[PDB]
Design a protein around this nucleic acid. Structure first.
Lengths: 333, 49
RNA sequence: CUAAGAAAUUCACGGCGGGCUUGAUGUCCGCGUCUACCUGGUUCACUGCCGUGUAGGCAG
């Protein structure tokens, strides 16, 4: 018996597009009304400071190229000059039961995966993965470049049942560390709530409110809208920021990628900090191919070893595999 | 067109940032001119050199 | 059984120097607005001396 070839693990822990507004610190308690940060426009005259060749380039050509300016046009977004706090608000559906997919060839593989995910729900419900998701919510990983340089970052997490509240935590993202993962009673409570929310025990819907003193007038960093620019259609414009209806927003993909930094046992290194959890797991910015497929430590070959040969490595690799299936994606080519 | 914000005339942030980093006094030409801005291929483009 | 399935995609920046917009002018002529009226609106379903617990007689 072989396994299914067309498989589609689905999205789970879906965050919303984070909207940004701006106001003053210590009046953040009664703040549901702050005006949105909007993407402004300005012009740039710069030099050319990139690396330049010494072969097949004329001396007069590079003398004419360095000494002539570059006049591009970019987008920015700043806080107002009397507002020193970047508010970031988003919601987070926690669905439940990310084990089984909904695209399967083999019925025997599908209920076999149901057998092993019911085994994992039986012996221990989602505890350390819930710890790591609740701790990424606890600090400000969703604040990417908004985090560094801030003197005070607060995370407030409310839970939704009806037009009312169920619990109101309060997390100090400066006091809560960045690298070494610990556990505390509020973090235990949030990890327990979404621990119920992950194993299909019902419906969990959260909304997270963040605050950050940066300083009045400073640069915020919404995400960047992409463009191909392959050859022709060069353009007067660069740095297209991302927006919604009249506000500066962060993509769902990148705040989800901020939620999915779990793996501390990748085989390349273990003291540099965690990386992003994905098959062929390697962060995009570094470019170094972490989690080489020629070892047994993929999601592909490891799932093929774990569902046919019925053997197992240590429990942390299974935490990585269960984080892969909570992540979603494609198994097989 | 002059740069502005809501109801206020403004200087860009990078113009102030350029005026802060005018430090370099060891470009190999001379000390007769003075400090220029720190830059790779350190170029005062406003005088074309 | 949602054209099924899924995705960090980026870091840096000096726009600037200069200028004569000016000359001249007829907005005109004429006109019918008129008929009738209940604000008691409660101008807070309320303001005050007996004990600051529903515990009192006034042209309220």
């Amino acid at each position: 018996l072989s396994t299914a070839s067309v498989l589609a693990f689905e999205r789970k822990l879906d965050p919303s597009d984070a909207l940004m507004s701006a106001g003053a610190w210590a009046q953040r308690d009664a703040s549901q009304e702050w005006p949105a940060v909007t993407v402004r426009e300005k012009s740039v005259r710069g030099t050319i400071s990139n690396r330049l060749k010494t072969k097949d380039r004329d001396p007069a050509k590079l003398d004419a190229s360095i000494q002539s300016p570059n006049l591009q046009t970019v987008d920015v977004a700043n806080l107002p000059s009397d507002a020193d706090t970047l508010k970031v608000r988003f919601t987070l559906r926690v669905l439940g039961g990310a084990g089984t997919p909904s695209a399967c060839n083999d019925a025997a593989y599908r209920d076999k995966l149901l057998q092993t995910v019911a085994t994992y729900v039986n012996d221990q419900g989602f505890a350390e993965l819930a710890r790591r998701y609740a701790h990424n919510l606890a600090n400000a990983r969703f604040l990417w470049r908004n985090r560094v340089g801030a003197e005070a970052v607060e995370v407030r997490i409310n839970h939704i049942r009806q037009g009312e509240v169920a619990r109101a935590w309060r997390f100090d993202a400066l006091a809560i560390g960045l690298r070494d993962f610990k556990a505390d009673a509020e973090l235990d409570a949030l990890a327990e709530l979404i621990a119920s929310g992950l194993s299909g025990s019902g419906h969990v819907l959260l909304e997270v409110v963040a605050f950050a003193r940066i300083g009045d007038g400073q640069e915020v960093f919404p995400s960047q809208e992409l463009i191909l620019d392959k050859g022709d259609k060069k353009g007067q414009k660069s740095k297209t920021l991302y927006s919604v209806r009249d506000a500066a927003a962060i993509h769902s993909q990148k705040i989800g990628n901020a939620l999915r930094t779990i793996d501390t046992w990748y085989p390349d290194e273990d003291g540099l900090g965690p990386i992003a959890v994905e098959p062929y797991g390697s962060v995009t910015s570094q470019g170094k191919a972490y989690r080489q497929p020629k070892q047994k430590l993929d999601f592909y070959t490891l799932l093929d070893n774990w569902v046919l040969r019925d053997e197992a490595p240590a429990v942390e690799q299974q935490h990585y595999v269960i984080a892969n299936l909570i992540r979603g994606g494609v198994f097989g080519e």
